[PDB]
Amino acid sequence: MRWKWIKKRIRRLKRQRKKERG
Amino acid sequence: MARMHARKRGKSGSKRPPRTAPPIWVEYTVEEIENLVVKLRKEGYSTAMIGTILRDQYGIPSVKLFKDPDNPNRNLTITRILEKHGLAPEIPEDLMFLIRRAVNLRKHLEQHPKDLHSMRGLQLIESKIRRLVKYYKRKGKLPKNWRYDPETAKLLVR
Amino acid sequence: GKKAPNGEFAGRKLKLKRKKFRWSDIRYKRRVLRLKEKSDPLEGAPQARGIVLEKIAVEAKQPNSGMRKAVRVQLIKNGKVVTAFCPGDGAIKFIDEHDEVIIEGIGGPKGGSMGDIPGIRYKVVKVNRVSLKELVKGRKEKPRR
Amino acid sequence: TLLDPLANALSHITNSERVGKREVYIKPASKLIGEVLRVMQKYGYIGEFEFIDDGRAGVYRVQLLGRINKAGAIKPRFPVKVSEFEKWEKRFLPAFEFGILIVSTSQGVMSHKEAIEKGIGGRLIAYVY
Amino acid sequence: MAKPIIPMPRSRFLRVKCIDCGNEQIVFSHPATKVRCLICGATLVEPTGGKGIVKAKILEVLE
RNA sequence: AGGUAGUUGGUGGGGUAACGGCCCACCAAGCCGAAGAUCGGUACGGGCCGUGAGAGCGGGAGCCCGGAGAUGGACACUGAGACA
RNA sequence: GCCCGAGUGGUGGCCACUAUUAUUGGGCCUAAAGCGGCCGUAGCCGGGCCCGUAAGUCCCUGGCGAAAUCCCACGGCUCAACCGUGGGGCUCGCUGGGGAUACUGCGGGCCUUGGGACCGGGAGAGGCCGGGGGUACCCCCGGGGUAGGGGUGAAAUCCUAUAAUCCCGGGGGGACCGCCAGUGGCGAAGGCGCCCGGCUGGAACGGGUCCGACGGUGAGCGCGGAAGGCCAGGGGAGCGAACCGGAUUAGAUACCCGGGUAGUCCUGGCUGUAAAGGAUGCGGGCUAGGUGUCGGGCGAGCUUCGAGCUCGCCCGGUGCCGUAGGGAAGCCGUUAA
C-alpha cells in the first residue's frame, strides 16, 4: 500500500508538475 | 529531592546536619573563626572549599550557626565575612566558576572541531550562565548594561 | 495537567484554544463561513420554482433497481441545472414539459440523497402551482396546459 | 519544581487515607497546610498532628481517624462571591450536610459552614469531606 | 533513609590525637580531603569513598 | 505580518458654535504592531429574542431605544435647527 | 387499530440530545490524536518565615445600568391570553466613600527543603585527535601441482589450459575489529563497541562545604538529527539500486545463481526524513511488594590481603513478576497507563 501510494502521489506530482513547469 | 537536568538520573541525597544551634564540644571565638577564613582566602582557595577545609580540619559544619548571633541582621558566613573586609570577588563565585570553565572549552573546540558532544555542552553551560546572569542583574551583583557573549566571557577571565 | 492552563490571567489562551478547535466541526465551520449557503444552489432557500427542461429516468443504487421518476428543471434566478426526484407512483404523467415546477430538498441538506437515489438532493412538490400529492388523488384538482 | 505545596500535602493525605495507613508524613510544610490542618482538626476530620521544624523544613505527622473521604485544593483558586457560594456549594461538596468548602477570608480561614455563619467570602483555597 | 521522618546524616565527631606531635584535632568522621596537622604538616586521614580512610595508627576518642 | 507621510508629536496660526493635523506654515521623526496591528470577509448596535437543568450556544423579527439612508453621486440657500 | 386533534404532516434553518468542542464537563500505548530530542524568549504557573501597602479579593454604604419582555403577588376584562398595581431580577461591562488583610499582586526584610555551585574517590561501546596490531577477503609475484572448477531443484551464462581450484613462500591494497558480549554499560536524541595515550562531554556517590527561590514549563525562536539522496574534492577490497546474462516459470521486468555502476569509506558542505517506539512530552508530590542485574556507600565473614568471594540495609540506574487501583480488553501497576 503506502509504497504504492507514495510513488503514485510522487508520479502524479511530477508528471503534473512537469505539465506546470511546462 | 532530585532534578534530572540534562539527565534522567536522580540527584545525590547528600543532607545537612539538622543542628540549628552549634556544637559547644567544638570551641571558637568570633575572632578566631574570622582569622581562619581570612587565611584561607589568602591562599587562593574559594568559599565552598574554604567551608570544606574548615569542616574537615576545625570541625565547624557551616559558619552561620556558630557565628550568628554576633550582629543578628542575618547569618554571618564566609563571604559575608569576606565582604566586610573587601576580600570578596565582585562577581559571585557561582557565576565565576561557571564562566571560568567555559573559556577552556572554547579552546578545545578551536583545535578539534569535529566534536558533537563537546560542542553540545558549550550550549549546555552558556545557558546556565545566561540564567545566572539574568537574575543577578535584578538582584544586583552585575550591572544592567551588561550582556553575555563569548568575547565578553574572554575579557572577564583575563 | 490535563490540558488547560489554569491560572487567573491565562484565560485568553483558553479563549483562543476553543475557537481554534471549534473549526474541526465541519458543520460549524461550514455555517460560520456559509458554505452551506453558497454551494448547493437555492441561495439557501426553503424552495425554488423552475422550468421543466425535460423528463429523465435514472437507475437505482446497489442492492436495488427501479426507475425513479426524475425531472430536469432549471431554477429561474439561480439559473442552475438541477436533476430531481419526483414523489408518487404514476406522477411523471401529470408533469408536462415546460410547466413551472417548484423544488425543495429531501432528507437533510448535507448532500444526502436518500438511500436508494444516488444524486438527487431535491424534491418536487408542484405542477402549475398545484402539487403532486394533490394529483395522486383524483378528486382534488387535475392539471392544465 | 513543586507548586501548590498545600495540594501536594492534601493529595497525599487523601491517598494516604484511601490505603488506610495509620498516620502520615508530609515533608514540605507551611502555614497554608498548617492552618488548613488546623481548621480541619477544628471541624474534627483528623486526629492529632505534630510538626517538627527541621532546619530543612517543617514536617507534619498526622493521625488518621478514618473520617475523610475526599479533600482537595482548587486549581486556579477562583474568587467566589457570597451569593455564588450556593453554586459552588452544589458542585464540589457531596451534600448540604458537610460544608467544608475551605475558602480563605477577610476574617481568617474558615470552612464553608464557618464562613456562612459569619457572612464574608473570597477566593477558594481547598475542600474537605 | 529518613527524608520525611527527619533526615539526619550518618555523621558523628571524633577527637583525633596526633602520634607524631600529640596535637589534638577535631575531625569529621568523613574526611573529604586531606586534613593536615597544624604542628606536624602530616596527613591524619586521606579522602576515598564514604568515610575518609585514616592513614596508619592515630589515636582516637569517639564523640 | 509588517503598516503608516497630515502620517505621530512640537511651535505658531486659520477656520469653525466650539477642542482638535480639523486645515495650514515652520520644525521634529515619531506613531501603530505577535496582549495580532494592517488587510480581507461578514455584519446596523442595544433592550431583548430562541433554545438549553445549568453553564452555554445561536439570533437582531414586530415593539421600544440610538445611529444611518431617501434612484446612484455631489452641492448650497432659507431658517434655532436641513445640506432637506 | 394507535396518536393527536382544527390541526396534522413535508422540505429547509437554529438549539437540544452531542462531556461530537469538554468552564461546569472529553481525550491522545494499541481505537483519532505526543512534536524524532533539546533549549530558552513572550506567556502562564511558584517552598517557608516577618513587616508595609490594600492593586486583585471579600464586606458595607452610596451614585447608576429607561420602559417593555421574564418571575411572584394582588386587582381588571365571563375565563385566560392581555392589561393595571405592587415586589423582584435583568447585558448588567461604569463610578465615589468607609472597612477587613487569609489568599493573591506589589514593595521591603529574613531562611535553606527546590535549583545551582565545590572537594574527593569511581565505571563506562560518550566525542575528537594522535599512535599502533592482528583476522579474514581480494589482488599481484615465484614455486609446487593437473582436468577441473563455478553454479542449481535441475541447468545455462560464466571461471580455468600460456595452467584455474588447490597447497607453500613472498609482496601490495582497502574494509573492518567474531569470541569477548551479559536478561550488561553510556548517551538528550539520532546513536555508540581492537588496543594505547592526549584533549574533552555527561553521569553516580560521601560530605549540603558555598549561593539563597535564583524555580517549572515553554508559543515564537535557536540548535543536534540513522539511512538514503545531492554537491566538490579524494579514494575504492568486498558488497551491491540501476544494469548485463542464466535459470525458474504459462509468461518473470523476481525470489535462486554469475558479472556490475552509482553508493557504501575519507574530507568539507547541503539536505532533515522514519514503525526517529516504550506507537507512552516534560517537572514535583503521594500510593503492597518480590526478585535479578549494573555502578556507588556502609556493617561483617572469607582472603590470593585486591572489595577478590559472599550476606544485608541504603542511594542512583537498568529488567522481569505482581497488591490496591486503572483499563474495553491485551495489559499497566514506585521506570504508572
Add this chain to the structure above:
RNA sequence: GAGCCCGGGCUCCGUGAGGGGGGAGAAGUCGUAACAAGGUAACCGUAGGGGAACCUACGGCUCGAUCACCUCCU
C-alpha cells in the same frame, strides 16, 4: 468642489473548447499484491526500475514469521 470622461494597471461577477480527481456501477482483461510464513515474512523512510498489482537496494521496526539450535527470567 460631485458626477462625468480618457489612457494604463490590478481584481471580481455571468459564461467556455479542453482538462483532474472523488464516491460508484460491478458480467469483460490482465496478474496474484496483501490477509495463513499468502507459498520470496510484513511494514517502514529514502532511491531506481517495471504495463499493473509490484520488484529490488540500503537503513530501521515488529504491529515477525514456524519448528529447530543456542542464550537468559519468576
Add this chain to the structure above:
RNA sequence: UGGAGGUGAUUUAAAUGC
C-alpha cells in the same frame, strides 16, 4: 511454570469463483 533475544532455516504443495 510462564516471557525475551542470537540464525539455520523448508521448497517436495499451482491463478480464479457471481
